[PDB]
Amino acid sequence: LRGSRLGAVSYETDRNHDLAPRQIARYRTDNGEEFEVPFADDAEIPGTWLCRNGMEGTLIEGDLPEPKKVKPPRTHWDMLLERRSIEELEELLKERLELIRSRRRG
Template sequence: MGRAGRRGLGWAGLTILEGIVRLTASLHPVPTKHTRRGKPIMGERMLRGSRLGAVSYESDRNTELAPRQTREYLCARGHQFEVPFAVDAEVPTTWECKFDGTVARLVDGSEPEQKKAKPPRTHWDMLLERRSIAELEDILAERLEEVRARRGRA
């Protein structure tokens, strides 16, 4: 830190502060690779971590994999690819294409079921949910009388 950064300290205070820093550094030296007992310090130990999707460090030797089935998918652009599934897994009818990201369908599979779409509700539909036709005719008659009365006064 430069001397300009230590505002408020006079020359005497500055030299005292520098002396304290030097004394502290000599009393507490920076540790080397090992402490007195020969064990590595925290910064020297190697911690092995992993992240999501990382490759496992375990080997596949002498392990039995779960039984698998391979299913083929075909996208609209003609890309055909295979996806492995567990034998007991439910195979989806659609899968994202590996090559272009479009929706691919299962080869020799059933068509995906279509979602039931609700017909759009209009303002008239919502109004009929709250009032009957007879009530609406009464309200219309009242409003027309008010409009005619205002026109007669004006």
């Protein structure tokens, strides 16, 4: 049988002289390791980047352009709070409170 990994091949000389000049950019990770990322000259350098370590790393250059935090994953508290009201959990809390403190005073 004849198969090939879906892809392509080029046949051109790998000229090592006449290329597009690069520009190495530093991206500090949360632990602080530095991972070089070569970029072209006329190229908008991003503030953040997924580094070689695999964790998000920000530019060594001072940018700090807002964390851009997302909404939290629905919690167990969220899934409980809808079906039940605060004051309604209040009476149950007092029942357990009196139970345990009756044990305490005993």
